[PDB]
């Protein structure tokens, strides 16, 4: 099919638009990884010394 202009060819971003098993396995892996980065970037954001003097 794909070895001609006529046949169907796949583009970029076609695993998420399908919405199947691999399309759901990708959304819950971008969220369970960038949930821990909202922990380490928020715990180290409390280490401002001027806020502690106000505390």
């Amino acid at each position: 099919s794909s070895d001609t202009p006529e046949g169907v060819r796949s583009g970029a971003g076609a695993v998420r638009d399908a919405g199947g098993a691999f399309g759901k396995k990708e959304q819950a892996d971008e969220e369970r990884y960038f949930r821990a980065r909202a922990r380490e970037q928020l715990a180290a954001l409390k280490k401002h010394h001027e806020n502690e003097i106000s505390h």
């Binding site: 099919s1 070895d3 001609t4 006529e6 046949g7």
Partner: protein
């Protein structure tokens, strides 16, 4: 063949523009189309042409025809009616033309029906 008894060849280029030009006369004449858009008479117009290409007792006529497959569908009714008439297929691969070989006939993807002990 009928008057001199030679062994003639015959070249048609191509056979898809004979099928497709048939399904525009049969729709200008007011007829209900068959499957995907072709004519009702797709199997007799290929019958009342390619049965005159035969080996009689005087001589013969051999035909080499070019075949274009629409939308890379081998089971579309235009390259499926034609395939019941052929006896041998030869395929020209472009990947052998960049290897230097001439003629660029693929040896593995060509089949013959008369290849038989």
């Amino acid at each position: 063949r009928d008057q001199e008894g030679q062994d003639v060849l015959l070249f048609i280029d191509n056979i898809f523009r004979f099928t497709q030009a048939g399904s525009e006369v049969s729709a200008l004449l007011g007829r209900i189309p068959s499957a995907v858009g072709y004519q009702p008479t797709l199997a007799t117009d290929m019958g009342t042409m390619q049965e005159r290409i035969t080996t009689t007792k005087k001589g013969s006529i051999t035909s080499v025809q070019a075949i274009y497959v629409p939308a890379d569908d081998l089971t579309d009714p235009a390259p499926a009616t034609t395939f019941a008439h052929l006896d041998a297929t030869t395929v020209l691969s472009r990947a052998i033309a960049e290897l230097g070989i001439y003629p660029a006939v693929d040896p593995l993807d060509s089949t013959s029906r008369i290849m038989d002990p």
